[PDB]
Amino acid sequence: ELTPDQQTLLHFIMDSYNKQRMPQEITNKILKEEFSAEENFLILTEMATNHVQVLVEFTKKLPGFQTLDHEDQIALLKGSAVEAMFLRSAEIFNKKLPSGHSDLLEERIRNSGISDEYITPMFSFYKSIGELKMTQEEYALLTAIVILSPDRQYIKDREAVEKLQEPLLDVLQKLCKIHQPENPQHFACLLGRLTELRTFNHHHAEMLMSWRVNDHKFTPLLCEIWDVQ
Amino acid sequence: DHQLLRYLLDK
Numbered sequence A: 001e002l003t004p005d006q007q008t009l010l011h012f013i014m015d016s017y018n019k020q021r022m023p024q025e026i027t028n029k030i031l032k033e034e035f036s037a038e039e040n041f042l043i044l045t046e047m048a049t050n051h052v053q054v055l056v057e058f059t060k061k062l063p064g065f066q067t068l069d070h071e072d073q074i075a076l077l078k079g080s081a082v083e084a085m086f087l088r089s090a091e092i093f094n095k096k097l098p099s100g101h102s103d104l105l106e107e108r109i110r111n112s113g114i115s116d117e118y119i120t121p122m123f124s125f126y127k128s129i130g131e132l133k134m135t136q137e138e139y140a141l142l143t144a145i146v147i148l149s150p151d152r153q154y155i156k157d158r159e160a161v162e163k164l165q166e167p168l169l170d171v172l173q174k175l176c177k178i179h180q181p182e183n184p185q186h187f188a189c190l191l192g193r194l195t196e197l198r199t200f201n202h203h204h205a206e207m208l209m210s211w212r213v214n215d216h217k218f219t220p221l222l223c224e225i226w227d228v229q
Numbered sequence B: 001d002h003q004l005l006r007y008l009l010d011k
């Protein structure tokens, strides 16, 4: 029922997760710039390359992350990049965060060179995850769990990560049985979405190919993290 | 390789 070691872990996490890292002058472009396929794409590239920085600075703050093998630290970042980004945007659409300009962010994604084959699943995903009516603690706990996934390919010590992940799952499960006793299946549902999240890694690899064969520019930072040759 | 990510971590 939320011990000390936990009421403290959660607070350190809600602390990081809550730092307003993305600059207002930057996210404001989602609202003020012209709406065209090219501009929508450039702005989305700028949000994503800025978000990569917020993630790393959030990940660094995750308990015991900095004690992991430097090679694994990369594998984890490269592995969860896409998923963590879907989680953040999902929160923008689901909980209508002001800094996200939800409806205008959606206009730009729906017209940035992405095939209907991916737009449909993508938004279908956002709708059902919103129906879980999650809290900021769940979103944050969820992201930290995704980043610390011992599953990611190329990990050298898949047990030192599980060990760093376990505490987080525990606090999430607890927080579920606590304010959601109504139904003891909520923890399971959240974890279910994790599986659905994974699905977009493939989709994202195809989206990048399409953008690339169409002469689209990313950033040195995005290219490194997504392995864009 | 991955000098950008490494650079962000060491920052």
Ligand SMILES: CC(C)c1onc(-c2c(Cl)cccc2Cl)c1COc1ccc2cc(-c3cccc(C(=O)O)c3)sc2c1
Pocket (backbone or CB within 6 Å): A022, A027, A041, A044, A045, A046, A047, A048, A049, A051, A081, A082, A085, A086, A088, A089, A092, A099, A100, A101, A105, A109, A112, A204, A207, A218, A222
């Ligand atoms: C390179 C780019 C064109 C791209 O390619 N695929 C995807 C993608 C798309 Cl469509 C959907 C899901 C995942 C990916 Cl990876 C993207 C866009 O990725 C991003 C990544 C992070 C953020 C954070 C935002 C944001 C806004 C306001 C406020 C905040 C805030 O944290 O306060 C965050 S928008 C945004 C857009």
